[PDB]
Amino acid sequence: HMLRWKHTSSLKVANEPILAFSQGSPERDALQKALKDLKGQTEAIPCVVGDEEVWTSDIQYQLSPFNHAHKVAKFCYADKALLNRAIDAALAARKEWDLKPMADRAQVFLKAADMLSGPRRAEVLAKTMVGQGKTVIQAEIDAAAELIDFFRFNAKFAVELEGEQPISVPPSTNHTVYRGLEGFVAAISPFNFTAIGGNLAGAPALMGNVVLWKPSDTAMLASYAVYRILREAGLPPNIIQFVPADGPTFGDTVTSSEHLCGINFTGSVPTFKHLWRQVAQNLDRFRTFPRLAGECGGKNFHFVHSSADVDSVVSGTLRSAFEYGGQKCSACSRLYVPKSLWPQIKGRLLEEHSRIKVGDPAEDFGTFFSAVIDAKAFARIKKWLEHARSSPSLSILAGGQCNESVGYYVEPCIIESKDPQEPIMKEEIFGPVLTVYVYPDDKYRETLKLVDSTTSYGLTGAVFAQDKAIVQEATRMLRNAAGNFYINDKSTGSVVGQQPFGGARASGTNDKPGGPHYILRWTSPQVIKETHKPLGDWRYSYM
Amino acid sequence: GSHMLRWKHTSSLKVANEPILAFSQGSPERDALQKALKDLKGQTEAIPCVVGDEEVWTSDIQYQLSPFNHAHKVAKFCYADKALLNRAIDAALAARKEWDLKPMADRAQVFLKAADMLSGPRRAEVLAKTMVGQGKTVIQAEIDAAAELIDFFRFNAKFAVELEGEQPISVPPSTNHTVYRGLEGFVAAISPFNFTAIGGNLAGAPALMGNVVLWKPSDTAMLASYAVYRILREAGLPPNIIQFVPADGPTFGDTVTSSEHLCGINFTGSVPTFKHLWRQVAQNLDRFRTFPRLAGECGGKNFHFVHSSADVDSVVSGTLRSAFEYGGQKCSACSRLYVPKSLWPQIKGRLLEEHSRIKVGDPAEDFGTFFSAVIDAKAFARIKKWLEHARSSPSLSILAGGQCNESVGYYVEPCIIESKDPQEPIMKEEIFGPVLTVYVYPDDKYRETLKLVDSTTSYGLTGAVFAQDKAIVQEATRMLRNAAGNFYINDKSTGSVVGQQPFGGARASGTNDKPGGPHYILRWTSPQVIKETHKPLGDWRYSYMQ
Ligand code: PRO
Ligand code: PRO
Ligand code: PRO
Ligand code: PRO
Ligand code: PRO
Ligand code: PRO
């Protein structure tokens, strides 16, 4: 017995509670304090390579979306030389980290999760509110609950994976070693969820990888807070490098390294395609075949059958379309309503719309949602509103206003299209812009087909109906129209361990972060066979 | 609050590895195999392309030759033209939704039935066709066309049926369920000559998971590949789920990568071809309805590393088998042997003595044959060039063998070469022939030499360490962690068994998706999660907002 394999244990975890933030609650008090702690503050956030805080001359600012005069962070872009130094230092740390027992790596993430749950909760929530423009509850479900859940559940999944071992038959013993990927992983995270950044960099690190993490410019404050928590929780130097950078510069640099083994990406279709093509162009140089994982957005639907509960349709659609300003890959942006229910649904939507509060989420907890993330987002959304004012098939029913004088404020907008295949029914806006198509009741089946065929995407979707046969039929018809499919619920708000998230078609590679299989993309297994008796003669008896 | 979607209870499956038969005199399997070999003598099968249930011929007629008697055309087949390939795609796509909607257990039943047929009544046929068409000996055919193929079918069925039991957490007011969807589109399966079982798995595993497939089998394994295809159809595989489409390689790749409906390529073959397909997909990335999934197994330059504490006889027997079985035509074959100076007199003497006893000949006529001819004229020519290199290189010396003769079959003697240069080209490049290179290292340089084992080649597939010192084994295991995806301690580098040693490696050796293990099938499903909520949603506002 040259090798001895220690018995793997099990990890019990459950989802983090979502807090209610009632008046006089400990969490509301703590959050109010943490928000006050950020008022008028700018954090100077360096690049971090190993334990070194590095500044370049390429200074950038993160602005508070609802008060863009407030520079919440000053940071800098890593240049090609710094990125390459970061790669070198990470690679030199990788073997030792990869050789650590899975349980020891998991412990770092479990400790981080407990820090986020307790003493650091108010901080990460406040930084997500002030830096990304989230309301209390949007920050809570993201920077606390989802991030905490990724860390705990991925830890559980990874520990359990070590229990997945092959059959051994005497006189040999077989064991699978879940090796990290050889090389480094580039993690490229989006502005819209603090938790996604934590997962994109953290999940590969958990599995024994080293990572260059390029956080989103517009989520820098909260992203660095998560980074610091991981380091304080025991993540060794050079396992995750914190390297904000210009997008093209970062992509060019990591795809030029012979040591690139993975890209973990969430963002646009064109950017993911470009990175895929850069890897293909440089395929000769890489020591192995890099693994690309991409989540690329959606044009998500709520489909209503005449049997639907109208109040649930209304509240679920308002939330899905407008929470966080519709800046979610999962947000409903196309609503299909039968003619027979349209007078009810139109009236209710327009009435509730007039009561939606858009304002400062730190100062007014009555706020439903706040400003969109930045000037570029504001400009894109304004372009779509101008299109809705131009198109003969479109009519703005409510909203349509925007004002960027103080923050990047866009009012929620509800549009009716007479054309089910209008460009606004197809293209992802990432803003609080809901388009409604009213279909004749006797054409529900033809309309279900349009739900499936109209767009290039396959991410989220919901069907509202109280008729079993209709639900069964719609489920079959929409099988590939949504990777996260909902019956009588809104299309947003996937919960780790409950609705693993992702979809195919143009929406990405569908590796389902939030489920037990995601971590498999970040391990390259080795199987070791040890034979305990001498080998026989090389000839066979039949010879 | 009633559940409108109802999910069936999941099942499990008990399977064990298919036992390897002995083929001793007096055994039924030896009798059956001799009859099956006789059934192939002097025969040529005309093998069509199969699209749906239609047998289709083109003008591009090709022949598969028996490697050890190349005057014997064992099969006449044809290459699908681009029109036929596109017709096959269209018909597969039209059949896909129904197949994807079939219960996993019903799809698994096809493969379990096929495995049962291969185990019993069809065993002798598939063995004989692999022997005569690919030049395998009885035992090499047995571990491949029977045991490994049967095991892929049974174990993947188990893995797939049981995968449906992997379900998310539900919390009130909702029920969550994962649907393991097949990929939307079609999968292209491209299989190699050297294992009948690999073709069955490359096409079969995606089909099991609800995909439809264009299977381009290897020209030089056509006879056995079609036998497997027919068995799958007889076992109940519906039409248009696997299209049997031999084709020119570049033509096939061009056609499948030009379709907007391509969702996967399941490939085993050369590094350059896999890279080319990868680049074709990238070039055409705009047109695809989704992002295609490429899986590739691409070969190796595999090592046996010997420490001074090794069991000498094990080193000798294990290395002779790994280097020379099936003429070294395995992605897992040992082609570099590292021996410490202190054991070299013993090991050299033993290797040379045993070498003189290795019989090369006709595997159908002489069951005493250790290995037979290599696969084809191209392989023979490549190997011959490497032998000539070994005679002309100042760093190389041929210790045994070196002869070859292609007058009757593509016959190459087993060859043992010593290199004085651990970085000689012959230590780096995959030959796919019976050519073993030995490097002798001073005992006191074992650590530096382990680093050379790891850094010399571009590959990471298989490797073995022979040693009876625990500290040395632990050290070597750490040092060689990424040098081999299938790593062996005191055993040979070939002969992975499904469910026991899932097979594959990284570096240039491929994407390492570990066929033979429980996770391989995950590459061929794109999961959907359905949440059904059983209570009304309530207001859009939250309590904290009041
Ligand atoms: O069932 C078995 O025998 C192997 C070893 C433990 C888990 N799987
Ligand atoms: O082209 C090659 O040889 C290496 C292998 C992995 C990708 N680059
Ligand atoms: O719309 C844009 O282009 C920028 C980038 C992410 C946030 N907004
Ligand atoms: O379901 C949602 O709303 C978020 C979007 C990214 C992943 N989960
Ligand atoms: O380029 C596009 O838009 C589609 C998305 C998946 C790949 N091709
Ligand atoms: O050596 C070659 O190129 C051919 C292809 C596989 C069989 N022999």
Ligand code: PRO
């Ligand atoms: O290990 C071996 O020898 C074979 C090679 C292909 C897969 N398994």
